[PDB]
Short mmCIF file of C-alpha atoms and ligand atoms in Angstrom, two decimals:
data_model
loop_
_atom_site.label_atom_id
_atom_site.label_comp_id
_atom_site.label_asym_id
_atom_site.label_seq_id
_atom_site.Cartn_x
_atom_site.Cartn_y
_atom_site.Cartn_z
CA UNK A 1 0.02 0.07 -0.07
CA UNK A 2 0.80 3.71 0.03
CA UNK A 3 -1.90 5.57 -1.89
CA UNK A 4 -4.06 8.19 -0.21
CA UNK A 5 -7.83 7.88 -0.71
CA UNK A 6 -7.71 11.36 -2.37
CA UNK A 7 -4.69 13.20 -3.68
CA UNK A 8 -3.12 15.92 -1.54
CA UNK A 9 -3.21 18.91 -3.87
CA UNK A 10 -1.49 21.46 -1.62
CA UNK A 11 1.30 23.28 -3.37
CA UNK A 12 4.60 24.28 -1.94
CA UNK A 13 5.94 27.14 -4.04
CA UNK A 14 8.90 29.32 -4.19
CA UNK A 15 10.12 32.06 -6.63
CA UNK A 16 13.02 34.43 -6.94
CA UNK A 17 15.07 36.59 -9.34
CA UNK A 18 18.61 37.65 -9.80
CA UNK A 19 21.64 37.30 -12.12
CA UNK A 20 19.25 37.95 -15.06
CA UNK A 21 17.21 34.92 -14.10
CA UNK A 22 13.75 34.44 -12.77
CA UNK A 23 12.50 31.14 -11.33
CA UNK A 24 9.42 29.54 -9.89
CA UNK A 25 8.80 26.08 -8.44
CA UNK A 26 6.05 23.80 -7.28
CA UNK A 27 6.04 20.59 -5.37
CA UNK A 28 2.91 18.44 -4.55
CA UNK A 29 2.57 15.21 -2.72
CA UNK A 30 -0.36 14.03 -4.98
CA UNK A 31 -1.55 10.46 -4.45
CA UNK A 32 1.41 9.28 -2.38
CA UNK A 33 1.08 8.84 1.43
CA UNK A 34 4.46 10.34 2.00
CA UNK A 35 6.28 13.33 0.40
CA UNK A 36 9.86 12.49 -0.36
CA UNK A 37 10.95 15.25 -2.63
CA UNK A 38 13.36 18.12 -2.06
CA UNK A 39 14.95 20.98 -4.02
CA UNK A 40 17.64 23.62 -4.04
CA UNK A 41 17.20 27.01 -5.63
CA UNK A 42 19.85 29.64 -5.08
CA UNK A 43 20.86 32.69 -7.03
CA UNK A 44 24.25 33.86 -6.09
CA UNK A 45 26.72 31.27 -4.67
CA UNK A 46 29.20 31.77 -1.79
CA UNK A 47 33.00 32.28 -1.93
CA UNK A 48 33.33 34.37 -5.13
CA UNK A 49 30.56 32.68 -7.19
CA UNK A 50 28.00 35.46 -6.58
CA UNK A 51 27.29 35.55 -10.37
CA UNK A 52 26.54 31.80 -10.27
CA UNK A 53 23.12 30.09 -9.57
CA UNK A 54 22.20 26.54 -8.70
CA UNK A 55 18.94 24.68 -9.03
CA UNK A 56 18.24 20.99 -8.39
CA UNK A 57 15.33 18.63 -7.78
CA UNK A 58 15.88 15.47 -5.61
CA UNK A 59 13.45 12.54 -5.93
CA UNK A 60 13.78 10.56 -2.69
CA UNK A 61 12.90 6.85 -2.24
CA UNK A 62 12.52 4.67 0.78
CA UNK A 63 12.53 7.88 2.82
CA UNK A 64 13.38 11.54 2.56
CA UNK A 65 16.63 11.71 4.65
CA UNK A 66 18.98 11.41 1.65
CA UNK A 67 17.00 13.91 -0.56
CA UNK A 68 16.87 16.47 2.33
CA UNK A 69 20.55 16.26 3.19
CA UNK A 70 21.37 16.77 -0.46
CA UNK A 71 19.12 19.68 -1.04
CA UNK A 72 20.96 21.48 1.85
CA UNK A 73 24.62 20.34 1.33
CA UNK A 74 25.20 19.04 -2.24
CA UNK A 75 26.12 22.47 -3.46
CA UNK A 76 28.74 22.98 -0.85
CA UNK A 77 30.25 19.52 -1.45
CA UNK A 78 30.48 20.47 -5.05
CA UNK A 79 32.05 23.88 -4.65
CA UNK A 80 34.23 23.13 -1.66
CA UNK A 81 36.53 20.53 -2.96
CA UNK A 82 39.99 20.69 -4.59
CA UNK A 83 38.68 19.59 -7.93
CA UNK A 84 36.15 22.38 -8.35
CA UNK A 85 38.59 25.01 -6.98
CA UNK A 86 41.66 24.06 -9.15
CA UNK A 87 42.90 26.41 -10.64
CA UNK A 88 43.87 30.11 -10.60
CA UNK A 89 40.78 32.13 -10.12
CA UNK A 90 37.94 31.19 -12.39
CA UNK A 91 37.16 27.48 -12.49
CA UNK A 92 37.73 25.80 -15.88
CA UNK A 93 35.07 23.71 -17.42
CA UNK A 94 37.17 20.71 -16.46
CA UNK A 95 37.27 21.96 -12.86
CA UNK A 96 33.50 22.36 -12.80
CA UNK A 97 32.83 18.93 -14.21
CA UNK A 98 35.43 17.17 -12.06
CA UNK A 99 34.25 19.25 -9.06
CA UNK A 100 30.67 18.15 -9.49
CA UNK A 101 31.75 14.43 -9.74
CA UNK A 102 33.91 14.72 -6.61
CA UNK A 103 31.01 16.52 -4.89
CA UNK A 104 28.66 13.54 -5.58
CA UNK A 105 31.11 10.87 -4.52
CA UNK A 106 32.13 12.77 -1.44
CA UNK A 107 28.58 13.63 -0.14
CA UNK A 108 27.62 9.91 -0.79
CA UNK A 109 30.55 8.75 1.40
CA UNK A 110 29.91 11.44 3.90
CA UNK A 111 26.24 10.25 4.37
CA UNK A 112 27.43 6.61 4.59
CA UNK A 113 29.79 7.50 7.52
CA UNK A 114 27.15 9.58 9.29
CA UNK A 115 24.74 6.70 8.95
CA UNK A 116 27.23 4.21 10.17
CA UNK A 117 28.15 6.36 13.11
CA UNK A 118 24.63 7.07 14.25
CA UNK A 119 23.24 3.62 13.37
CA UNK A 120 20.86 5.15 10.97
CA UNK A 121 17.74 3.12 10.43
CA UNK A 122 16.71 4.59 7.09
CA UNK A 123 17.63 2.83 3.85
CA UNK A 124 16.68 5.87 1.70
CA UNK A 125 18.19 7.11 -1.58
CA UNK A 126 17.63 10.02 -3.96
CA UNK A 127 18.05 10.98 -7.53
CA UNK A 128 19.39 14.47 -8.35
CA UNK A 129 18.97 16.60 -11.42
CA UNK A 130 20.01 20.25 -11.56
CA UNK A 131 21.91 23.06 -13.39
CA UNK A 132 24.80 25.12 -12.24
CA UNK A 133 24.51 28.40 -14.08
CA UNK A 134 27.62 30.53 -14.55
CA UNK A 135 27.74 33.81 -16.47
CA UNK A 136 28.79 31.92 -19.67
CA UNK A 137 27.72 28.21 -19.16
CA UNK A 138 24.89 26.12 -18.11
CA UNK A 139 26.06 22.84 -16.52
CA UNK A 140 23.40 20.18 -16.46
CA UNK A 141 23.85 17.53 -13.84
CA UNK A 142 22.01 14.27 -13.62
CA UNK A 143 22.08 11.28 -11.30
CA UNK A 144 19.05 8.97 -11.64
CA UNK A 145 15.66 9.23 -13.47
CA UNK A 146 14.71 12.86 -12.73
CA UNK A 147 15.31 14.89 -15.89
CA UNK A 148 16.12 18.50 -17.02
CA UNK A 149 15.82 20.29 -20.26
CA UNK A 150 16.85 23.54 -21.99
CA UNK A 151 14.57 25.39 -24.27
CA UNK A 152 16.33 27.50 -26.80
CA UNK A 153 14.73 29.35 -29.81
CA UNK A 154 11.44 27.54 -29.00
CA UNK A 155 12.91 24.02 -29.18
CA UNK A 156 14.33 21.40 -26.93
CA UNK A 157 17.96 22.23 -27.14
CA UNK A 158 19.23 19.62 -24.67
CA UNK A 159 17.74 17.13 -22.18
CA UNK A 160 19.32 14.88 -19.64
CA UNK A 161 19.46 11.10 -20.32
CA UNK A 162 17.66 9.19 -17.54
CA UNK A 163 19.76 6.53 -15.78
CA UNK A 164 17.78 3.28 -15.94
CA UNK A 165 19.05 -0.15 -14.98
CA UNK A 166 18.15 -1.59 -18.37
CA UNK A 167 20.35 0.85 -20.24
CA UNK A 168 23.40 -0.99 -21.75
CA UNK A 169 26.18 0.49 -19.77
CA UNK A 170 24.19 0.44 -16.56
CA UNK A 171 23.24 -3.18 -17.03
CA UNK A 172 26.86 -4.01 -17.67
CA UNK A 173 27.99 -2.34 -14.37
CA UNK A 174 25.15 -4.12 -12.45
CA UNK A 175 26.07 -7.62 -13.89
CA UNK A 176 29.82 -7.03 -13.23
CA UNK A 177 28.84 -6.15 -9.69
CA UNK A 178 27.21 -9.56 -9.26
CA UNK A 179 23.73 -8.28 -9.73
CA UNK A 180 21.07 -8.67 -12.42
CA UNK A 181 18.52 -6.41 -14.16
CA UNK A 182 15.05 -7.99 -13.96
CA UNK A 183 12.81 -6.14 -16.41
CA UNK A 184 13.63 -2.56 -15.33
CA UNK A 185 14.85 -3.25 -11.75
CA UNK A 186 18.16 -4.00 -10.16
CA UNK A 187 17.73 -7.55 -8.66
CA UNK A 188 13.89 -7.00 -9.27
CA UNK A 189 13.88 -4.12 -6.69
CA UNK A 190 15.36 -0.81 -7.58
CA UNK A 191 14.01 1.10 -10.62
CA UNK A 192 17.04 3.36 -10.63
CA UNK A 193 20.69 2.74 -11.51
CA UNK A 194 22.12 5.83 -10.17
CA UNK A 195 21.39 7.59 -6.88
CA UNK A 196 22.85 8.97 -3.70
CA UNK A 197 22.14 6.76 -0.84
CA UNK A 198 20.87 3.22 -1.36
CA UNK A 199 23.95 2.00 0.65
CA UNK A 200 22.73 -1.61 0.72
CA UNK A 201 23.40 -1.62 -3.08
CA UNK A 202 26.90 -0.16 -2.64
CA UNK A 203 28.56 -2.98 -0.58
CA UNK A 204 30.23 -4.98 -3.42
CA UNK A 205 33.68 -5.97 -2.41
CA UNK A 206 36.41 -5.61 -5.01
CA UNK A 207 34.57 -2.76 -6.82
CA UNK A 208 35.06 1.00 -6.50
CA UNK A 209 32.35 3.55 -5.63
CA UNK A 210 31.27 3.94 -9.16
CA UNK A 211 31.29 0.21 -9.95
CA UNK A 212 28.66 -0.82 -7.40
CA UNK A 213 25.14 -2.01 -8.20
CA UNK A 214 23.91 1.54 -7.83
CA UNK A 215 26.28 4.42 -8.67
CA UNK A 216 26.45 8.03 -7.30
CA UNK A 217 28.30 9.16 -10.36
CA UNK A 218 26.67 12.09 -12.10
CA UNK A 219 26.61 12.79 -15.79
CA UNK A 220 27.50 16.54 -16.49
CA UNK A 221 27.15 18.48 -19.72
CA UNK A 222 28.34 22.00 -20.35
CA UNK A 223 26.27 24.14 -22.66
CA UNK A 224 27.54 27.57 -23.58
CA UNK A 225 24.93 30.22 -22.84
CA UNK A 226 23.18 32.17 -25.53
CA UNK A 227 21.82 35.58 -24.32
CA UNK A 228 19.73 35.88 -27.48
CA UNK A 229 18.29 32.38 -27.75
CA UNK A 230 18.10 30.81 -24.19
CA UNK A 231 14.52 30.76 -23.09
CA UNK A 232 13.99 28.44 -20.05
CA UNK A 233 15.10 25.36 -18.19
CA UNK A 234 12.74 22.84 -16.64
CA UNK A 235 13.87 20.48 -13.90
CA UNK A 236 11.41 17.88 -12.69
CA UNK A 237 11.06 14.38 -11.21
CA UNK A 238 9.73 11.35 -12.96
CA UNK A 239 6.30 12.15 -11.51
CA UNK A 240 6.19 14.79 -14.23
CA UNK A 241 8.13 13.05 -17.04
CA UNK A 242 6.17 9.84 -16.71
CA UNK A 243 3.07 11.53 -18.29
CA UNK A 244 4.58 14.35 -20.44
CA UNK A 245 7.30 14.11 -23.07
CA UNK A 246 10.09 16.65 -23.55
CA UNK A 247 8.56 18.43 -26.58
CA UNK A 248 4.97 18.33 -24.98
CA UNK A 249 6.13 19.95 -21.78
CA UNK A 250 8.29 22.41 -23.51
CA UNK A 251 5.37 23.46 -25.79
CA UNK A 252 2.95 23.50 -22.85
CA UNK A 253 5.23 25.65 -20.69
CA UNK A 254 5.75 28.12 -23.54
CA UNK A 255 1.89 28.32 -24.04
CA UNK A 256 1.55 29.08 -20.31
CA UNK A 257 4.32 31.75 -20.38
CA UNK A 258 2.54 33.52 -23.19
CA UNK A 259 -0.47 33.91 -20.79
CA UNK A 260 1.30 34.72 -17.43
CA UNK A 261 4.72 35.58 -16.06
CA UNK A 262 3.86 34.28 -12.64
CA UNK A 263 6.28 31.32 -12.63
CA UNK A 264 4.82 29.65 -9.57
CA UNK A 265 1.48 29.62 -11.32
CA UNK A 266 3.02 28.05 -14.41
CA UNK A 267 4.62 25.37 -12.26
CA UNK A 268 1.36 24.78 -10.54
CA UNK A 269 -0.29 24.35 -13.95
CA UNK A 270 2.27 21.74 -14.94
CA UNK A 271 1.96 19.81 -11.72
CA UNK A 272 -1.93 19.78 -11.72
CA UNK A 273 -1.91 18.88 -15.41
CA UNK A 274 0.34 15.81 -14.75
CA UNK A 275 -1.85 14.77 -11.91
CA UNK A 276 -4.89 14.95 -14.35
CA UNK A 277 -2.98 13.01 -16.90
CA UNK A 278 -2.82 10.28 -14.29
CA UNK A 279 0.50 10.69 -12.47
CA UNK A 280 0.24 8.99 -9.05
CA UNK A 281 3.65 10.02 -7.75
CA UNK A 282 4.98 13.03 -5.77
CA UNK A 283 5.72 15.85 -8.28
CA UNK A 284 8.14 18.71 -8.23
CA UNK A 285 9.14 21.09 -11.00
CA UNK A 286 11.46 24.12 -11.18
CA UNK A 287 11.13 26.59 -14.05
CA UNK A 288 14.11 28.89 -14.66
CA UNK A 289 13.47 31.68 -17.19
CA UNK A 290 16.20 33.63 -18.93
CA UNK A 291 15.85 37.20 -20.16
CA UNK A 292 14.53 36.05 -23.61
CA UNK A 293 12.00 33.57 -22.35
CA UNK A 294 8.66 34.01 -24.04
CA UNK A 295 6.63 37.12 -23.02
CA UNK A 296 3.06 37.51 -22.16
CA UNK A 297 1.06 38.00 -25.33
CA UNK A 298 -2.19 39.99 -25.43
CA UNK A 299 -3.65 37.66 -28.13
CA UNK A 300 -2.61 34.60 -26.11
CA UNK A 301 -4.37 36.08 -23.02
CA UNK A 302 -7.54 36.73 -25.12
CA UNK A 303 -7.61 33.33 -26.74
CA UNK A 304 -7.24 31.83 -23.22
CA UNK A 305 -10.28 33.84 -21.93
CA UNK A 306 -12.24 32.83 -24.93
CA UNK A 307 -11.43 29.17 -24.34
CA UNK A 308 -12.38 29.46 -20.70
CA UNK A 309 -15.65 30.96 -21.51
CA UNK A 310 -16.32 28.39 -24.18
CA UNK A 311 -15.67 25.57 -21.79
CA UNK A 312 -17.90 27.11 -19.24
CA UNK A 313 -20.76 27.31 -21.63
CA UNK A 314 -20.22 23.71 -22.60
CA UNK A 315 -20.27 22.63 -18.97
CA UNK A 316 -23.51 24.49 -18.54
CA UNK A 317 -25.06 22.77 -21.46
CA UNK A 318 -23.74 19.21 -20.74
CA UNK A 319 -25.35 19.50 -17.35
CA UNK A 320 -28.45 20.91 -19.17
CA UNK A 326 -26.75 15.19 -13.28
CA UNK A 327 -23.46 13.74 -14.67
CA UNK A 328 -20.49 13.63 -12.43
CA UNK A 329 -17.38 15.54 -13.28
CA UNK A 330 -15.76 12.42 -14.59
CA UNK A 331 -18.70 12.06 -17.13
CA UNK A 332 -18.52 15.71 -18.04
CA UNK A 333 -14.73 15.49 -18.77
CA UNK A 334 -15.59 12.43 -20.84
CA UNK A 335 -18.15 14.29 -22.91
CA UNK A 336 -15.91 17.23 -23.42
CA UNK A 337 -13.11 14.89 -24.59
CA UNK A 338 -15.46 13.38 -27.26
CA UNK A 339 -16.20 16.81 -28.52
CA UNK A 340 -12.55 17.20 -29.88
CA UNK A 341 -12.45 20.90 -28.81
CA UNK A 342 -9.99 22.88 -30.83
CA UNK A 343 -7.26 25.39 -29.47
CA UNK A 344 -6.53 23.40 -26.30
CA UNK A 345 -3.04 24.07 -24.78
CA UNK A 346 -0.30 22.17 -26.71
CA UNK A 347 0.92 19.21 -24.61
CA UNK A 348 -1.45 19.97 -21.68
CA UNK A 349 -4.66 19.24 -23.71
CA UNK A 350 -7.94 18.84 -21.87
CA UNK A 351 -6.15 17.87 -18.65
CA UNK A 352 -4.56 21.22 -18.49
CA UNK A 353 -8.15 22.74 -18.68
CA UNK A 354 -9.47 20.51 -15.90
CA UNK A 355 -9.17 23.23 -13.15
CA UNK A 356 -11.30 25.55 -15.26
CA UNK A 357 -13.90 22.94 -15.88
CA UNK A 358 -14.03 21.84 -12.39
CA UNK A 359 -14.47 25.35 -11.09
CA UNK A 360 -17.52 25.76 -13.33
CA UNK A 361 -18.85 22.32 -12.59
CA UNK A 362 -18.55 23.20 -8.86
CA UNK A 363 -20.49 26.42 -9.17
CA UNK A 364 -23.30 24.42 -10.83
CA UNK A 365 -23.21 21.36 -8.70
CA UNK A 366 -21.84 22.40 -5.31
CA UNK A 367 -23.24 19.45 -3.39
MN1 LIG B 1 9.29 9.85 -8.33
#
């Protein structure tokens, strides 16, 4: 077990701006009995990196301890090691990448020793996906099956590759570590091949830290920034990506940015939409907008109001007492034009439900 009888829709939001960036984020427990997600969102880093920013989403499993420790200390483990520092004044691309790798391996070992010392009872682990944004580069960081993407010139310019046990190189490591991949799971249990924590899967004698059943090793990609063309970055857990593809979500987010510049609201729209598309997991998303992110469009705002009015009239008529499920089903059969790209009817469910509720409050 572990599903609630009804989803917990409460949103935890944050927003901020600086270094030319604006961001919003939303997390929601949804159908799950526990919330095991965390995030980091910081504009302006310590120790001479004030023009830097860092954003990350951590999808915890078997507990929130690992995800919570990461969201508070991963960044310092990355920036405060000899690999990141190097190196004259400004960190080279190699310093940044090596520094991030060392940061992951060191925080993992750090947690392992803390747990050993205090006889920790939890056996939790966590994915991490994030971006370290410098004045000239965006470094995407991925460890696990959370995912991030960069929208540039209205297209998906880059997205992180999910670490899954069945991936060829992952399966190879797992087998060489004495394990197997059964369907999509390590030993028929873990659905992730890389994560922080999961120390029971990191006890293989004769294998280094990155050769275990589960690896803490991140994949890092440096993308040179384009002031003219960079639009936004989306970071989210698999609770989002399970039900929306890269291009769908990019298109959907664009469509929402053309209607509002409230980034928390856009993130809330993504999360609700994914819930309505059937996601039964915790959900978290961070949206980071660059200076040339899409701007609110008067025509887009009008089209949205026209659509909302149209849906309201349809609901009025369909009622003429069908439940909401049946009203949604009727609306779907109508093949209504001009729904949000990617979001589709699910992304309009809040509008529909609001009207339905005014008409059938009991
Ligand atoms: Mn998840």
